[PDB]
Amino acid sequence: LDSLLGQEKERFQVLPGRDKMLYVAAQNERDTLWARQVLARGDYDKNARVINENEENKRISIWLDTYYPQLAYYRIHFDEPRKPVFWLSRQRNTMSKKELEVLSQKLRALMPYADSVNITLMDDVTAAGQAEAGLKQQALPYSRRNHKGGVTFVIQGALDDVEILRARQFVDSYYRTWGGRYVQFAIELKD
Amino acid sequence: LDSLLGQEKERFQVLPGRDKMLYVAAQNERDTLWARQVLARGDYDKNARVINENEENKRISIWLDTYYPQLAYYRIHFDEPRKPVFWLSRQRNTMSKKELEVLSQKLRALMPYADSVNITLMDDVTAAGQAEAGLKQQALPYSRRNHKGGVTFVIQGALDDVEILRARQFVDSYYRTWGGRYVQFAIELKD
Amino acid sequence: LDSLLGQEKERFQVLPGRDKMLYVAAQNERDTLWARQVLARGDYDKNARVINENEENKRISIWLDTYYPQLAYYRIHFDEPRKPVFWLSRQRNTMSKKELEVLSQKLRALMPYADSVNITLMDDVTAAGQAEAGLKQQALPYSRRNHKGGVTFVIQGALDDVEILRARQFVDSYYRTWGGRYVQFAIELKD
Incomplete structure (x- = not known):
């Protein structure tokens, strides 16, 4: 691994992926761009990836439109990128505990850098x-x-x-x- | 430690952190900026941090929107930065003594430079x-x-x-x- | 001590502090400024301080807004800087003799140059x-x-x-x- 040129590492939370790739959680768009461009000059493609809260949430939502289109949810919060929090619609959601556990593991597949995904039914x-x-x-x-x-x-x-x-x-x-x-x-x- | 270029130390209250980093409590914005820039020229990043009343209060408030969103409070006062005072809404707050003790320890985690946080229910x-x-x-x-x-x-x-x-x-x-x-x-x- | 460049000492009442610092009680703003600037050229900072009636009263009042916000008072008189006189609102004040004795010692802490603070309930x-x-x-x-x-x-x-x-x-x-x-x-x- 590494496959990292984030240094200065300020505003770059680098998390190890389950797919043996690194995910540099950048604070903002300009940082994302900076890290992607520097890694590219450095010939650290493929294994060295750069991510952020907005792109990762939209990415999972696109996957959800195909596999859980009926999922009533709010947003995935990346305050702690290693443990994403997934706000669900308490009442509109009709999924079981185990179905929600599968949903989490599916997002864990979508987020190799995440240890686990904490899905919570937020009171509508x-x-x-x-x-x-x-x-x-x-x-x-x-x-x-x-x-x-x-x-x-x-x-x-x-x-x-x-x-x-x-x-x-x-x-x-x-x-x-x-x-x-x-x-x-x-x-x-x-x- | 130190990892300090505050000298002249006038208007720079330097407090030792629990995370083994130094927190230079600057009197104002211009002082904050002065100390951050000088520490940076000096290659004292990471461990040497510079803070102030306004930024530290807003920083803790941002953390609170995620972990105690229902916390009814006023403001955190840094008259004594080593012992911050946290004004809470006496009546709007429904937290217990021990829950408030946890809230304090959570702010102590947010403020390694603080010895303890004195939370007080201010009469609405x-x-x-x-x-x-x-x-x-x-x-x-x-x-x-x-x-x-x-x-x-x-x-x-x-x-x-x-x-x-x-x-x-x-x-x-x-x-x-x-x-x-x-x-x-x-x-x-x-x- | 001294840590004094007041000479010519006319209009500079120099009082020894309890904190082992000197407090040059200047007659006016221009004198305060003169003494502070001369002490600074002289490398007599920290221990050599310059003060006046207006700044010391406002300084204690700022401290009082935090620790005795309910204190009903008039003004602290520095006719004799070594023994400040503190005019209190006779009727609006509800403090006890011993609480007022603590208030005085707290101002003595705020005024190391003062021997004692004479607090008096002034008839409203x-x-x-x-x-x-x-x-x-x-x-x-x-x-x-x-x-x-x-x-x-x-x-x-x-x-x-x-x-x-x-x-x-x-x-x-x-x-x-x-x-x-x-x-x-x-x-x-x-x-």
Whole structure:
């Protein structure tokens, strides 16, 4: 192994894979690019791979559209890349304990660098309540619409220039940890 | 250790970490930057770290969003960096004594330079009363609104140019020690 | 010790500290600056410190906001820097004799150059009566308003150019010995 040119290793969490390849978990896009380009100049292809939170989540989601298309989930969190956390829709999900254990091992196959994948049924009430709470904190009333498989919070109120930005950060916050798979959002000028 | 180029050490409180790294508690941003740049010219990376009150509080808060998302708190004070004080929402917090002791040890892990973290349940009545008192001292009446998990004091009155600045310092004062997590503020021109 | 370049020592009251450092009590800002700059050219840092009435009072007040935030006080007088006098709000203060003795020792820790700190409960009636008297001496009637924790004397009367200056000196006088912590002031044109 190594098959690593990350040094300076700041913002490069390098994890050993189960497939005998190295996965350099880069903090951001510019770091990912830096490490991939340097490894390529260095003739460390194939075995030396560079990854990040966004690409690995989308990669697993693409695999899931084919093998667990009915999986109701939120997002895979890579706060600890060696132990990814997989947020599932508590109520929309109808999988068994053992089926979820298989799902984890399948993601472990998708993530050789991961030791194990911690799949957790996240309370759909908590998802809805997180969105509810964030809006109410910003004095943003909403009308709750119902799209297939979820709800859409339509923010009421003629918002000011910066109040709109406040609502955009709220929306992004929910889309960072939960995603747009359960509560989606809209803005409409009222009152 | 050391792995220190702070000299002149004025405004650089250097504390030894539990992880065998040094944490230079700098008085301000310009000092933080000065020390980080000088340590870097000096080839004292990794083990020689430079920190401050604002970055360390935000760093712990980011960790808390993942592991104690339901933690109702105000702010972590670094008046004594070696013994950080952690203001919690007395009433909104439902944690036990031992759970709070774990929370402290978790922050001690987040702050190797800290000897211990003193977590204290701050009276939510006192928070509200601090805001109330600061406004009344400046002859600023307010309408108490209710956002999720707190209240919003909407300052009544067509304020003058400098009265507005008086209200801004009041608001900042509360946002310095309590933060915008319980009493938030607004201004509206009346009378 | 010394660790002193004050000479000419006129307007430089040099007091020995309990922390084995020297505190040059300078008469004014320009003297403070002069002594700090000269000590610095001289390589007498650390042990040779330069102080004044305004900075030392504000320094102790900042410490008090964290450890005795409920302390109702006026101002610390440095007429005799070696024995600072600490004016407290007689009625607003609810501290015991021994708690006040601790408060003094805490300020003695904040002021190594001080032998002892004389804390005195100043009659709030006298504070109010000082303000009352100063206004009445200048033929300035006022309406007594009530802000949280104090009163605001609103000066009645269309004042002339120099009468306004007379009221400003009155206000400053009260803000010199009592401060704006109990009786505050305003001006409004009437009659």
